[PDB]
């Protein structure tokens, strides 16, 4: 589950 690190960061930018 490595991309979970980039998925969470993206959701923060897509808030």
UniProtKB/Swiss-Prot annotation:
Superkingdom of origin organism: Eukaryota
Residues binding heparin, per UniProt: 6-12
Protein name: Platelet factor 4, short form
Residues of the full protein shown: 87 to 101 of 101
């Amino acid at each position: 589950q490595a991309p979970a690190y980039k998925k969470a960061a993206k959701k923060l930018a897509e808030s």
